[PDB]
């Protein structure tokens, strides 16, 4: 609903998965 | 998923398995977009060339799973389907244009640590995130490679597989295939000279292509695994249903029947 897309075992506990950084890097790096 | 890796537990809580009821058979990936709605590829339900024509009663879904085959008590949940909705202008003949379907759960599913919905994108998120070279994430329990071999056959995984792949320029997409592609699909994958690889594969059909917004930290489903020429071939790309472009159809259906 309004809580969509925030994962109980990651975002909600301030924890990152092992590869999400790769996506963020793709947004920034030329 | 070809050239992916084991998912972490609860990495993809919106992940859904689509099964044929009888005989029991994993058909496709899918995703949870609300407590009672599941998104998937139209071709998972209807594909004349392959004699596929499933209706609500032929199917069930499994939510919260990690392992492909093991039963996972107190984590996974099973649901039947009230109705199936295939996009009226789905074109299986020419180009799998509008390869999208919605599945209403007969009974709402309970959210948990292992079961949580994904966001559908608004105009801004789509316009911001859907750019050539930006990567999304594809997940599924489909085959590990295109061709059969003796080592577990075509290779099927123990646990949910994950791979990240960059969105590709539409000219490159269009040049890669004889098929007349439309604005309702995009393509993703490394180029030959990029020297990373990865792709969806047979059985990943209908599962989600997700991106994490750096604006609000939320995961959005931009794509549905749709079609490709084999898996992980050089100079070929996976095609994905453009979720944002079909959001009005999604919303009209959720409104009129939910
Ligand atoms: N690598 C991926 N990300 N995904 C591909 C998984 C793996 C992929 N499978 C699908 O996409 C299956 C599917 C569901 C519904 C259709 N549809 C098809 O194969 C349909 N055509 C013809 C077509 C294209 C657009 C509209 O219809 C795919 C195709 C396109 C161009 C040239 C050849 C082909 C057939 S390639 C061999 C074929 C097979 N003999 O299994 N398919 C695959 O290898
Ligand atoms: C699929 O099955 C239903 C009957 O359950 C039928 O009414 C429909 O026309 C079929 N679609 C085809 C053959 O394309
Ligand atoms: Na490729």
Numbering used by the authors:
A (entry chain A): 1C, 1B, 1A, 1 to 14, 14A, 14B, 14C, 14D, ...
B (entry chain B): 16 to 36, 36A, 37 to 60, 60A, 60B, 60C, 60D, 60E, ...
What does the publication say?
We have established a solution-phase macrocycle synthesis strategy in which three building blocks are coupled sequentially in efficient alkylation reactions that eliminate the need for product purification. We next applied the strategy to synthesize a combinatorial library of 3780 macrocycles, which we screened against the coagulation protease thrombin, a validated target of anti-coagulation therapy. Screening against thrombin yielded a potent and selective inhibitor (Ki = 4.2 ± 0.8 nM) that efficiently blocked blood coagulation in human plasma. Structure–activity relationship and X-ray crystallography analysis revealed that two of the three building blocks acted synergistically and underscored the importance of combinatorial screening in macrocycle development.
